[PDB]
Every structure is written in structure tokens, then in C-alpha cells.
Amino acid sequence: FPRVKNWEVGSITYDTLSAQAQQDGPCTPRRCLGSLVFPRKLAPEQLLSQARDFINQYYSSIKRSGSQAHEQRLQEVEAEVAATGTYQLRESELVFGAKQAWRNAPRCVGRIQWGKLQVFDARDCRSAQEMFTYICNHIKYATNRGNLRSAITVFPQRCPGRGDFRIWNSQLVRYAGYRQQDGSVRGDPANVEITELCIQHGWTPGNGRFDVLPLLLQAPDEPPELFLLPPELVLEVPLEHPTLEWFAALGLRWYALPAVSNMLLEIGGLEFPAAPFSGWYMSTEIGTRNLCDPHRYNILEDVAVCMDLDTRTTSSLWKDKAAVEINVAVLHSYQLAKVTIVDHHAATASFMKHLENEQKARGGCPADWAWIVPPISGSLTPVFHQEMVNYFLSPAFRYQPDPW
Amino acid sequence: KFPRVKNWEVGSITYDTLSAQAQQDGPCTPRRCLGSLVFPAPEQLLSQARDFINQYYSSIKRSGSQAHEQRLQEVEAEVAATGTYQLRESELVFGAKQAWRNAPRCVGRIQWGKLQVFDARDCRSAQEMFTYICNHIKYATNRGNLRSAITVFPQRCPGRGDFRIWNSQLVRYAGYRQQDGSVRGDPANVEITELCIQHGWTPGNGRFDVLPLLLQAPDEPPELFLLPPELVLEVPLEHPTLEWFAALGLRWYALPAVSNMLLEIGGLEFPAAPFSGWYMSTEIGTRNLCDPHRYNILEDVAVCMDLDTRTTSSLWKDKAAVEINVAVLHSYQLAKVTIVDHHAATASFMKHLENEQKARGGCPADWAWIVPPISGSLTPVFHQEMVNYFLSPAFRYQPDPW
Ligand code: HEM
Ligand code: HEM
Ligand SMILES: CN[C@@H](C)Cc1cc(C#N)cc(OCc2ccc3c(C)cc(N)nc3c2)c1
Ligand SMILES: CN[C@@H](C)Cc1cc(C#N)cc(OCc2ccc3c(C)cc(N)nc3c2)c1
Ligand SMILES: C[C@H](O)[C@H](O)[C@H]1CNc2nc(N)[nH]c(=O)c2N1
Ligand SMILES: C[C@H](O)[C@H](O)[C@H]1CNc2nc(N)[nH]c(=O)c2N1
Ligand SMILES: [Cl-]
Numbered sequence A: 001f002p003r004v005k006n007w008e009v010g011s012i013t014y015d016t017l018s019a020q021a022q023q024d025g026p027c028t029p030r031r032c033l034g035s036l037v038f039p040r041k042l043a044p045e046q047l048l049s050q051a052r053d054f055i056n057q058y059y060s061s062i063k064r065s066g067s068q069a070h071e072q073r074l075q076e077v078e079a080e081v082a083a084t085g086t087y088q089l090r091e092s093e094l095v096f097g098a099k100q101a102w103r104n105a106p107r108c109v110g111r112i113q114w115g116k117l118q119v120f121d122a123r124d125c126r127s128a129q130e131m132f133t134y135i136c137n138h139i140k141y142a143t144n145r146g147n148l149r150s151a152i153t154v155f156p157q158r159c160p161g162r163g164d165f166r167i168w169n170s171q172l173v174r175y176a177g178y179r180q181q182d183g184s185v186r187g188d189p190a191n192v193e194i195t196e197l198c199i200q201h202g203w204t205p206g207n208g209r210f211d212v213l214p215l216l217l218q219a220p221d222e223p224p225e226l227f228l229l230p231p232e233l234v235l236e237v238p239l240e241h242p243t244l245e246w247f248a249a250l251g252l253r254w255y256a257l258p259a260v261s262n263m264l265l266e267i268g269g270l271e272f273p274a275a276p277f278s279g280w281y282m283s284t285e286i287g288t289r290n291l292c293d294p295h296r297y298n299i300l301e302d303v304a305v306c307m308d309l310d311t312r313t314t315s316s317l318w319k320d321k322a323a324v325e326i327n328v329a330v331l332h333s334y335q336l337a338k339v340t341i342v343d344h345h346a347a348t349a350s351f352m353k354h355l356e357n358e359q360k361a362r363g364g365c366p367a368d369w370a371w372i373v374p375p376i377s378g379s380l381t382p383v384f385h386q387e388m389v390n391y392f393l394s395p396a397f398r399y400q401p402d403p404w
Numbered sequence B: 001k002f003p004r005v006k007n008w009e010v011g012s013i014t015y016d017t018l019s020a021q022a023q024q025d026g027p028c029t030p031r032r033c034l035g036s037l038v039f040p041a042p043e044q045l046l047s048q049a050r051d052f053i054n055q056y057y058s059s060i061k062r063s064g065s066q067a068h069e070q071r072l073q074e075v076e077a078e079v080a081a082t083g084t085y086q087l088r089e090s091e092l093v094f095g096a097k098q099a100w101r102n103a104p105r106c107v108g109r110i111q112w113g114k115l116q117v118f119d120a121r122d123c124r125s126a127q128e129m130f131t132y133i134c135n136h137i138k139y140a141t142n143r144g145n146l147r148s149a150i151t152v153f154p155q156r157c158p159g160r161g162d163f164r165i166w167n168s169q170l171v172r173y174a175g176y177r178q179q180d181g182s183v184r185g186d187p188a189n190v191e192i193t194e195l196c197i198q199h200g201w202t203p204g205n206g207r208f209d210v211l212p213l214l215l216q217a218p219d220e221p222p223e224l225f226l227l228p229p230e231l232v233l234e235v236p237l238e239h240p241t242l243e244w245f246a247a248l249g250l251r252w253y254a255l256p257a258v259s260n261m262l263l264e265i266g267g268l269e270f271p272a273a274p275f276s277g278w279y280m281s282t283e284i285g286t287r288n289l290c291d292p293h294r295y296n297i298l299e300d301v302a303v304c305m306d307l308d309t310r311t312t313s314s315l316w317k318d319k320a321a322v323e324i325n326v327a328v329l330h331s332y333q334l335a336k337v338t339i340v341d342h343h344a345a346t347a348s349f350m351k352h353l354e355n356e357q358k359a360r361g362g363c364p365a366d367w368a369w370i371v372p373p374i375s376g377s378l379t380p381v382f383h384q385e386m387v388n389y390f391l392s393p394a395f396r397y398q399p400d401p402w
């Protein structure tokens, strides 16, 4: 039972939940690989064992463990698999599954919200157009005219044999990236790949560097097709700065809804290749990684030049100065537009609150320190000086190979 | 079957074969990771010692030679007669450097090959100890142009006690417990301050009182020593434009000289072997001055900057902090005392990784410690994957002798 200490306060806790961890991670006693983005890499007897674990933590989670309906539900599931191979979840369990997996996402700093997640059951989906509507309701529900709401939409579970549902975009809302006779990129270089996969599917390229990409959806076996997004349901925020009047004229913007559509939801031993979720941004994601990463928009030195900072030398800390103000502009803009946003100080402190809750509940909490700690002002936030244990619980969100 | 490590900023892929030599085991299992934890006979001395001799004769391109096979036989025979063995002049220099080179949490290792090794293995008392220490500080400080150095005191041996330096650093500021239940000076050194005073030291009342040394010879009680005022170089902290900053009465010292870690070389352990380099501005600016439990000036500074401290989204914490770092970097250059900012430091650390990959095919590195405590993703070490492991020679922790 690992001794985890908070060095800011001096409190000490033992992580008993880590003991009930399961599927092994990339670390061994001779070398720690906990800074790896993808943990190493990417007659079904398995399903039943995974199926009981989930059903049982379901019923213990509502006290109804032992005898009566609990006794009863386990048999119907045993019967269901024995005859069919796969099995179906009761809708309540699906909600349970969705929520617990958000609770078990080691890299996510917004888990204090895990008890508040809207679950759109789309297991009866049968088409490529049928996904697209199920998506549009999500975006509209989740955007809620800027008062963002946590939501996930589960599409039908991939079957024994035969194809699966799969969204092809990393996110439902992404900007394009274009090449040229310089080979450089106008737009979002992270999404050039999918933009490449779009144009040769019939899409027409664009003008500026903030062209919202078109969705590329795909139902079993019949190859994917394009779906153009309605601009009313893609709410963006133009970026301005509370006192740097020249900042607006950089023509910067970002979308409201962070909604990730290429990860795999696993519940009770079933795999959902298509099951996109959404919440709301933390400022640093937009201002620090999306706008300032060298292999992203890379706006840093432009902002510095407008601030008349000394870029000739690193010790002037112009990089740090411009970053802080770009972040200030994100938080300001989003609140002007009345779109839900959280600063990294408020987000982290609530994640402390979340640990303390989880301690009384499940005696531990899988947390990935290299990701909970914010990408700027790290030590200034409470999570920095807090020791964490990272491990794998189920249900969980898993990465998966991309289908191109 | 060696770790594949990627740099995501550029796109580089290398494999860490050096990690397979990892001559120890840490806290991480396939079941869970504990990378964030701060604290993670004759035959056995034999296998470690034999490994270091093999190391040393490779660095001078003479592996498997006459002098090598001689040196092996010499060693294992001497452990049979005495229980231990003594390092030569040149081996001690090599082991010392190899310990810096291997230290996973150090971003300044680009410089490991330039370390001034002092041999004080002949030390006899607490007074000679002080004298070697005063001399170290003098060479290293160098009137502001800093120099990397280590002083090596007598190795741990059976039958005699240990040399220890009781202070965590050669230079540290006093921490006075107040009537209010507050602390004057540095709160991190409340404990060592206790010991000094109860061992006959006359306490000051300042926020930056430089602590005496508690120095202990074998089987002796520790003996108190005052560093000559003019030996310790200190830097007044001011800000290039915020002029009220200087009225804060803040200062920091030039030489960071960690004095409480253990130096292990080929199975021998030197419990007293202080070493020093120069400061990176964030250690002083972010960590020492802004950590809530240390000097805690962050809020008190933002209030002066007229920032909105009533709410987080104004990022008043982040703004205060960057100007505190700026003040550190400015004050040290104004006083011509060597210092390195976290962009330059991480940048040179990336050269080191390129160097070590060609030299030993890898590099022990602790991601959580290599990434500066402000502005991580701005630095090139943020987006670089790393492998943490333990190679020997090495600097290790050890308990407080009290
Ligand atoms: C509501 C406020 C939320 C905030 C502020 C938030 C914030 C974050 C942040 C900062 C990351 C780091 C990943 C990156 O840097 O790209 C992350 C990752 C993650 N989040 Fe959250 N999130 C929220 C909601 C949610 C929801 C609703 C879910 C699921 C239903 C979720 C599940 C996850 C998962 C699985 C990851 C890991 C992604 C990966 O491994 O690459 N989060 N989140
Ligand atoms: C010359 C300039 C140097 C710089 C800029 C530098 C930088 C750093 C920094 C910033 C840390 C982490 C600080 C912290 O704990 O907050 C560190 C750790 C460390 N460095 Fe250095 N260093 C330098 C010289 C040296 C030398 C000369 C040695 C050995 C002779 C050394 C060995 C170590 C070791 C063993 C640690 C880890 C200590 C621990 O884990 O508690 N460094 N370095
Ligand atoms: C930029 N980091 C990438 C390099 C790694 C990454 C991979 C995947 C996948 N698959 C998905 C990723 O998305 C991260 C994520 C997922 C969900 C989020 C939600 C729901 C809210 C939020 N504010 N940020 C999120 C961030 C990231
Ligand atoms: C504030 N850090 C603590 C939380 C952890 C720590 C513990 C010890 C010990 N013993 C020693 C430590 O030393 C860090 C260190 C060691 C050597 C350094 C040198 C030689 C130079 C430099 N600029 N910084 C150093 C920083 C750290
Ligand atoms: C190399 C490094 O581990 C990796 O790029 C991680 C570090 N921490 C991160 N943290 C968050 N939130 N998002 C990221 O993309 C990363 N990148
Ligand atoms: C608990 C936390 O991981 C620990 O306090 C570490 C994090 N990384 C660090 N990195 C450096 N360079 N110095 C430190 O003191 C710390 N503190
Ligand atoms: Cl994003």
C-alpha cells in the first residue's frame, strides 16, 4: 500500500485502490517510463471475467450487493454470453460504465465533475447519416449557447466479426492545415493529416487559418463519407485582450467545445470504438499548448514583438511574459462571450478536492502527475507538490489505432 | 526490447540501451507507477567494485589490459585482508564525475566533464574539515565567476565513525520560530537552526542570517563553525523596472553547495562529499521565494504590482512569479555572479541527451524534475520522453545523523 505524501501540507495517505489495479503499465523496477505518451504500444474466454467484475461493482455501488436482484442479474449475463458470445448492458449500467471510466481517466484534471455526465444512448444506431444527427444533438446539447455541459454519446458496440462504428476526426471541431511550395502549414498543423484525408474525399480547401474541418463519419464496412457542419452549431470565440488593444487584430480565435472522437470506451469487457465525449476547456489547453506549441500555431514570438519584448535574449523571459498574456486573453475572451472556461489554478485546486473525496470513497485515485500538473506555472498550483500513483482501473477510456 | 523514446516537438526516435545496465531497482511495477515520489557483505562489495574498475578502464580506452587485470586482482585481495579497499587519485576523479553524469534529476549535466575534484580523504579532525570547506567555497565562488567542484572526505570504514556535515547546504539561512507560530527567515531550515543554537550558537533575528556549520569527525560530537562573513557571496535582489522591489530587503547567495548526500563509488561510500555548481534562476525565483512553505512572497508581491488578487483568472500568481524570476536574473547579472535561466538550461540539457545517446546509448532522466517549475511546455524538455533509472557511481540520500 503506497505511502503518498503531500509536501505542501505534510499530510500522508495510503493508496489501497492501486492494489485493485489490473492491466499492466509500461514501468518495471529497473526503469520508469511514466513519461511515455502511449504506454508502450497498442475463443474469447476474456469477456465473462470482465463482465462479472463490472456487474458486481455496479451493485455494490448502489448497496444492492448480495442476494435478491444482484444474485439475479449475474445469471442473465452469464446466459447472454453463453448463447451469443457478446452481451448487452442494461442502460443504467451503461451510464455507470460511462461515468466510472471518466472517474478512472488518469490524465484528466476535471474529474471532480465525474458525477455530472449526460449519457446519450445511441446503441440503436444503424447508419452513417444516423450518426451525424446523433452528433449534432450532442454538440447543440453540450454547447447550450455557451453554458457548456459534460456529455458523451455511445454508438453501438463493435460486434463479434463485422465492422465497427468510428468517427475519423480526433475531435468533432478542428481547424484545417494546408501545404504549399514551402511545405509549411497555414492553419492547425496537428490536424493536417485529417485535412489531407478530407480533400481527397471531396472537400474544398479554404481561406484563413481557422477553417473548421468537415466531419468524416463511418458505419460498419461501408467506407466513410463527408458531412459538412452547420456554422450556427459551431460556436467560436474571437480572441481579444482586456488592455492590449492590438491583440484583436491578430485575427485569433478558438472553438467552444472540446469534444474528442477517436478514443475507445471499455465497459464490463465490451469495446466501443466510437463514443465521443465533451466537457469544457481549461485555459492552458488553448493559450499554452494549442496557440504556443512550436508544432501547433506557434504564435509566441509574434505576441512578444507586439509587446516590444527583448527577443534577442532568453533571460529577458519574453517567452514567459507573452505566454501569460495570451492565457489572459483566452480567459477574458471566453468570459466576454459567456462561454464556460476554467483557469488552471481553479481546475487544479478542485482536483485536490477530488483526491480527498476519492480517498474516503475508494481509498485511492489513479492520477498521472505529468498531465495533472499544468503546462505553465506548475509549482504555483497545489498538484505540483503532491505525490501521485498512476495505474489502470476499469472501466476506462483507451486509445486505439486510427482507421486510415 | 529496450524502451523506445520519442521527442514530440521535432519527431526524433531513439532507443535507450543504457537502461539495461541499470544496476539497481526502483519503486515502479507493471501494476502502478510511483515516479512522483520524492524518496523512491564481502562478496557484494566485490561485484560493485569490479564493475567500477571495468568502467574506469573503459573511459581511458584500456579495458581488459595488464594494468586492468592487475587492478582487479589488487582490489579483491585487499578486501580479503582489510575488508575494504582504497581508490587511487585518478579513479576518484573519474567516479566523482560519473556520479554527476548519472544524477537523473540534474538539468545542468552538460557540464559534468568539467568538475574540480578535491581530495580531502586525509582529513583528521573537525577543524581540518572546516579548512577544506572554506577552501572549497573560496575556489567555487571565485568572486562571482562560478566553478563546479566537489570535496571528498574520508570514506566510510569499519571501526571508526563517519565524517558528516550536518547542514543540508554549506550556505543556508536561519529559520526562527515566532511567538505567532510564524517563521522568520527560511522555514526549510528551522530544524538545523534548532541544532546550531542548542549547540551553543548565538541567534540573530534577521530573515537572511547565514547559518554556522555543524561538522562531525568520527565518534566525536559535532562541532560548530562560523563561516567568515567575507567568504559568503550574497546578491541583493532588485527589479530592472519595478523599483519598489528593492525595498523588499530580499537577497540570495551565490553558491548552491549541497552537503548532505552520499557519494557511492565502486562499493565504497563517502558520507561526506559536498558539491557545488551554480544556480538556475527558477530555484531561487519560483521554488525558494514562491513555494508557500518557503519564503512565500508571491501574494505580497502581486499586491504591490496592483494585481487583482481576489480571483484566480486574473493570473496574478503567474504574473508575480515571472517578475520575481526576472528580478533574480537581473540582480545576479548586475553583480556579475554566474546564473542560468531555465530556457538556456533546458536547451543545453537537450544537447547533453544527444551527446549521451552517442556515448553510452542513453541517459537516466527524471521528467518531473528536469522540467522547470514554471513554463514547462515552453521549454524543449517538456515534449521529450524520458527513461528514469539508477546507474553507479551515484549520489544518494541518507538519514540525518540526529
Ligand atoms: C468538464 C471539464 C474537463 C476538463 C477541464 C478536462 C481537462 C482535461 C485535460 C487538461 C486533459 C489533458 C489532456 C491534454 O492535455 O490533451 C484531459 C484529458 C482527458 N480527459 Fe478530461 N476534462 C474535462 C472533462 C472530461 C470528460 C467529460 C471526460 C469523459 C467523459 C474526460 C476524460 C478525459 C480522458 C479519458 C483524458 C485523457 C486523454 C488522453 O489520454 O490523451 N474529461 N482532460
Ligand atoms: C553547474 C550548474 C548546475 C545546475 C544549473 C544544476 C541544476 C540542477 C537543478 C535545477 C536540480 C534540481 C533542483 C531542485 O531539487 O529543486 C539539480 C539536481 C541535482 N544535481 Fe545539479 N546542477 C548543477 C551542478 C551540479 C553538480 C556540480 C553536481 C554534482 C557534483 C550536480 C548534481 C545534482 C544532483 C545529485 C541532483 C539531484 C539532487 C536530489 O535529487 O535531491 N549538479 N541540478
Ligand atoms: C494534445 N494531447 C495529445 C498529444 C494526446 C491526446 C491523445 C488523444 C487520443 N486518442 C486524445 C487527447 O485529448 C485530450 C483531451 C480529451 C478530452 C478532454 C476533455 C473532455 C475536456 C478538456 N478540457 N480537454 C480534453 C483533452 C489527447
Ligand atoms: C528543494 N529540493 C528538495 C525538495 C529535494 C532535495 C533534497 C536534497 C537533499 N538531501 C537535495 C536536493 O538538491 C537539489 C540540488 C542539488 C544540487 C544542485 C547543484 C549542485 C546546483 C544547483 N544549481 N542546484 C542543485 C540542486 C534537493
Ligand atoms: C513528453 C511528455 O510526457 C508529453 O508530451 C506530455 C507531458 N505532459 C502533458 N500534459 C498534458 N496535459 N498534455 C500533454 O500533451 C502533455 N504532454
Ligand atoms: C512532489 C513533487 O514531485 C516534488 O516536490 C518535486 C517535483 N519536481 C521537482 N523538480 C525540481 N527541479 N525541484 C523540486 O524540488 C521538485 N519537486
Ligand atoms: Cl485542444
Ligand SMILES: [Cl-]
Pocket (backbone or CB within 6 Å): B256, B283, B288
Ligand atoms: Cl536552493
Ligand SMILES: [Gd]
Pocket (backbone or CB within 6 Å): A308
Ligand atoms: Gd510601438
Ligand SMILES: [Gd]
Pocket (backbone or CB within 6 Å): B241, B242, B243
Ligand atoms: Gd518603474
Ligand SMILES: [Zn+2]
Pocket (backbone or CB within 6 Å): A027, A031, A032, A033, A034, B028, B032, B033, B034, B035
Ligand atoms: Zn514509473
Ligand SMILES: [Zn+2]
Pocket (backbone or CB within 6 Å): A379, A385, B287, B291
Ligand atoms: Zn517547491
